[PDB]
Design a protein around this ligand. Structure first.
Ligand code: GA3
Length: 321
């Protein structure tokens, strides 16, 4: 089943979020900010990892939190190391790079990768609709590539992985596509329960609706909140290989590690997403965690948690050179 601590943690979010979504498609933003569990950045290492907050684009107030083992001016490292650009989940609406669940996950990523994590505080819906979150991810990719500190190896370049869960996995994808269109090299994408959608329901959507925290009513709400006012769930932001989609054959697209919870009602879409990437000639590794609900990567309390941290470490190591 669901471990008790997972059930209690994810239910606390579910029940809180229930009161923040308004029927008219606006959001209780001030109360949301007040109720979120967050931590500050700290230059003093906790369990060997330090963090730093930094504004990278004044025009939109765009902030990142940088994590490293324990400066942006420093020389490129001789030996390759990964830079993971991370986009938090929260369905385009919730959470922040400072949210404790994501601060914790990024710290674990540093220990795992022996690299640097850059967690992006992208602009959120409904106040900031498509394509703002994608713009912010592109901004963060270009910024990372330009810093001497982020660069490593013989060719002195940033070895970038784009990563995110939920809405953040969606963002990682669109940023990766933009990178491939502009000939910017991304070493890999790491998607955890990447958020995709469509006008029709899939089998998994109908079967799992309401059973493990997530409801179709809330998924529909979040898509409505992020997508343009005149759009529907077949908008390509939402359904990148659907009727209005675009195939990616021929692009220098990143290799992908695609992690999917079997008890996430959108699993069908995630696997069809992976299938499409393969169909287009790109390299994909899918890790299906059959017994896992949304959020499982947030608590170190299941086999799937351990399995996935290991798959992430292997993927990083395999794609660094
Ligand atoms: C309204 C929401 C938003 C959820 C799904 C849910 O239906 C209930 C649980 C939310 C959530 C809470 C915290 C994490 O940010 C998230 C990715 C998750 O695992 O669970 C969050 C997740 C998400 O953003 O996809």
């Amino acid at each position: 089943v669901v471990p008790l601590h997972t059930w209690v943690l994810i239910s606390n979010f579910k029940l809180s979020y229930n009161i923040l979504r308004r029927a008219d498609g606006t959001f209780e933003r001030d109360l949301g900010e007040y109720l979120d569990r967050r931590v500050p950045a700290n230059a003093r290492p906790l369990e060997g990892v330090s963090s730093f907050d930094h504004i990278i684009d004044q025009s939109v107030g765009l902030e990142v939190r940088i994590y490293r083992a324990a400066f942006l001016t420093d020389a490129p490292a001789a030996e390759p190391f990964p830079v993971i650009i991370f986009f938090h989940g929260g369905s385009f609406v919730h959470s922040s790079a400072s949210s404790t669940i994501y601060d914790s996950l990024c710290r674990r990523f540093v220990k795992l990768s022996k690299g640097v994590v850059v967690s992006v505080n992208y602009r959120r819906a409904p106040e900031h609709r498509y394509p703002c979150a994608y713009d912010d991810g592109w901004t963060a990719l270009k910024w990372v590539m330009s810093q001497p500190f982020m660069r490593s190896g013989g060719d002195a370049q940033a070895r970038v992985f784009l990563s995110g869960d939920s809405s953040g996995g969606n963002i990682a994808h669109h940023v990766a596509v933009r990178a491939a269109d502009e000939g910017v090299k991304v070493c890999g994408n790491i998607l955890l329960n990447a958020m995709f959608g469509g006008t029709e329901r899939t089998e998994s959507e109908r079967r799992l609706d309401g059973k493990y925290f997530v409801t179709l009513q809330d998924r529909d709400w979040y898509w409505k909140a992020y997508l343009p006012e005149d759009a529907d769930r077949d908008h390509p932001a939402c359904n990148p290989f659907g009727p209005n989609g675009r195939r990616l054959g021929g692009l220098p697209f990143a290799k992908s590690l695609i992690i999917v919870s079997g008890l996430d009602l959108t699993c069908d879409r995630q696997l069809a997403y992976a299938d499409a990437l393969r169909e287009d000639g790109h390299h994909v590794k899918v890790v299906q965690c059959e017994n896992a609900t949304v959020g499982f990567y947030l608590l170190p309390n299941t086999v799937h948690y351990h399995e996935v941290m290991e798959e992430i470490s292997d993927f990083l190591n395999a794609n660094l050179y």
